[PDB]
């Protein structure tokens, strides 16, 4: 029991909670995000997460194979998940590159983001403590934008390719290569440290944040909604796809996570515990972030919505600020970023392993030939690093933001989750699936899961998509910038490169299989034993 609970606590939290959720919540205006978020956590989210584990357990096979047994026509969902994981793994590691750079820069007697005597700083600087007495900029924000990020005036201006962050990406990819090649993962007594350190750090940071002199305004911003004005189309896709990204459902790795488990287990209770713990830790760390932002606003005299960047940088603006104000700042900075790198790697390893297993299962005859595995992992890492280089240029932030919005989140997750629930509920049959679940776990899904698959998840995933297209607004990075049309075309190119895998495989199989049209449709709709 104890070891299982510890594994449950440690294995499923990740950067989706500590980094992604805060900046989406801040970008959509605080508390207005929590309403559509909890409307997607139940009636979708948790019922889809259970369905994902059950599919993997039921097939005893990866993402590519299970849909062959459930519904051959929709086998393309496996390739959709695999390509989503690929586009994710390309960009997800750049966060660890930034974290590693912060870790290296933390090795100083005085943190570089504490004061702006340093060379990279604009003359418009004002030390945060003196700013309360214009264009004044805080040292942390411009450190992030000019030393770490070296942000160029747009995606149209890639500029130079930063050697330091390229070294960081190479370092992290080398770690991943050697770990997955050797099969290294935290399983030993080191688990008691690895799985608990993130929660220790988050509790310490929450204590630091709430004790700040400006926490109350931050929490009031964080929890008081704007129900009458915030309901644009963006917030609804952001909220739903935050659940689906955080749970890593449509990525297909959870099919592997379930297939590895013993079948004779109460998968229902385990899935409800995991999904509630993940959503709870996200919601709890929200307090630390937004209390720190309330302190930043109180200490500078600007509205909370304006204190920090609304893009990916929110965590790397907020936590450095908090760690600047604790005894021996360097110690806690080092601890924070080591914790962040551990929390990131424990996810990166799982995603890479899932991708490698899926791709070798898609072509075992060549990939399974002994050293073929070791060579193939190196190939995948090399290609991923060569793509990641683009997000390391002076214009790299804009490409990273474009990936983070279109490539592995947004409307494509809603596409894949709609088709999963539609297939199982209406094509395969909720009745058949309930009988299968009775066989596996001993009791049927019940009404909440049954109707969540039949009606609620289809309805939500169609409504958010149609609403997005009916009231369409483009991407912006930090709210003053605008992406050019070619960048928005590239974003849709990624999203569609994920989404189209369903129609393409449907038509391919309808054409590749002999017989009359309806005969082929029946042959490919019917399950396999």
């Amino acid at each position, epitope marked *: 029991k104890i070891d299982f609970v510890l594994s449950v606590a440690g294995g499923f939290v990740g950067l989706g909670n500590v980094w992604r959720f805060p900046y989406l919540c801040y970008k959509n205006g605080g508390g207005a995000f929590l309403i559509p978020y909890f409307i997607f956590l139940f009636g979708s989210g948790l019922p889809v997460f259970f369905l994902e584990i059950i599919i993997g357990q039921y097939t005893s096979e990866g993402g590519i194979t299970c849909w062959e047994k459930i519904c051959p026509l929709f086998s393309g969902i496996g390739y959709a998940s695999v390509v989503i994981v690929s586009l994710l793994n390309v960009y997800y590691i750049v966060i660890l590159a930034w974290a590693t750079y912060y870790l290296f820069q933390s090795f100083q007697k005085e943190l570089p983001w504490a004061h702006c005597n340093h060379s990279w700083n604009t003359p418009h600087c004002m030390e945060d403590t003196m700013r309360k007495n214009t264009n004044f900029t805080s040292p942390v924000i411009e450190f992030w934008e000019r030393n770490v990020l070296s942000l160029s005036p747009g995606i149209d201006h890639p500029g130079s390719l930063k050697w330091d962050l390229a070294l960081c990406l190479l370092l992290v990819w080398l770690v991943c290569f050697f770990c997955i090649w050797k099969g290294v993962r935290s399983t030993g007594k080191v688990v008691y440290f690895t799985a608990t350190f993130p929660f220790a750090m988050l509790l310490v940071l929450l204590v630091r944040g709430l004790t700040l002199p400006g926490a109350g305004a931050g929490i009031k911003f964080y929890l008081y909604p704007d129900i009458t004005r915030l309901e644009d189309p963006q917030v609804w896709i952001d909220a739903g796809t935050q659940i689906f990204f955080s749970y890593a459902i449509c990525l297909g790795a959870m099919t592997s996570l379930g297939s590895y488990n013993k079948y*004779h287990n*109460n998968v229902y209770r385990d899935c409800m515990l995991l999904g509630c713990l993940n959503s709870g830790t996200s919601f709890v760390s929200g307090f630390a972030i937004f209390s720190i932002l309330g302190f930043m606003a109180q200490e500078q005299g600007v509205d909370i919505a304006d204190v920090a960047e609304s893009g990916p940088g929110l965590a790397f603006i907020a936590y450095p600020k908090a760690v600047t104000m604790m005894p021996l700042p360097t110690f806690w900075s080092i601890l924070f970023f080591i914790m962040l790198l551990l929390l990131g790697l424990d996810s990166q390893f799982v995603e890479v392993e899932g991708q490698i297993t899926s791709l070798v299962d898609l072509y075992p005859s060549f990939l399974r030939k002994g050293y073929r595995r070791e060579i193939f992992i190196a190939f995948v890492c090399s290609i991923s690093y060569l793509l990641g280089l683009t997000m390391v240029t002076e214009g790299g932030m804009y490409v990273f933001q474009l990936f983070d919005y279109y490539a592995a989140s947004g409307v494509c997750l809603l596409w894949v989750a709609f088709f999963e629930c539609f297939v199982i509920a209406w094509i395969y049959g909720g*009745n*058949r699936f*309930s*009988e*299968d679940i*009775r*066989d596996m776990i*001993g*009791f*049927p899904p019940g009404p909440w899961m049954k109707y969540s698959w039949a009606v609620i998840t289809p309805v939500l995933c169609v409504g958010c998509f149609i609403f997005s297209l009916v009231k369409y607004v483009p991407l912006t990075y930090n709210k003053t910038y605008v992406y050019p049309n070619w960048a928005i075309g590239l974003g849709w190119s990624l999203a569609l490169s994920s989404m189209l895998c369903v129609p393409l495989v449907i038509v391919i199989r309808l054409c590749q299989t002999e017989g009359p049209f309806l005969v082929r449709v029946k042959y490919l709709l019917t399950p396999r034993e």
Partner: antibody
Amino acid sequence: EVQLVESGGGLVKPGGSLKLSCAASGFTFSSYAMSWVRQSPEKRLEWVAEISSGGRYIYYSDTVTGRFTISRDNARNILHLEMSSLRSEDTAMYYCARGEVRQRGFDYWGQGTTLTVS
Amino acid sequence: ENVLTQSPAIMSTSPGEKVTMTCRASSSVGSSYLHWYQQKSGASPKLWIYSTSNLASGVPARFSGSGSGTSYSLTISSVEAEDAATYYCQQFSGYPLTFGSGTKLEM
């Protein structure tokens, strides 16, 4: 969920064949797994066979693995147990028992019907 | 087959006394997958206890159960004349399903 009623008990020669029926009422018979449980003259219960709610999954006790075939009629709300070759040890009183939730046991039992061979 | 056996094959009893019965299995089974049934003489069995401690809808509160792993039990806080019946422990963790030998309260 209220009622279950077995039928078809009686006497049949050893090595013969016989088929039992178990009617159901008061619940959606097409959505609950059903089981047959056998009580010997020594009052000892034994399990016979299970059919899942949809009839796709079927399990048999080893002692009848090849002798008995279980089936159901969802439209008629009737459960069937067919015996192809009765051994002398098959005489008992047969109960059909509703068993959808394995974590919740056999919630309901029919009146039961005796079966004998000589 | 995971054979189940109950130790006290038959028990004499009088009103008001405390009474308990034991179930043991050839192989350990999860707590959730073990149940107890009551059969009155000349009548069909009825579910009495499920998931090893949960009480059925018609059972007096004086019944109770506990156990884990390979051995399980139920106990009566204080018997009454209406409790005279045979009780079977039954595992539900894996086929073939098996019922215990059954134990009867004779008075």
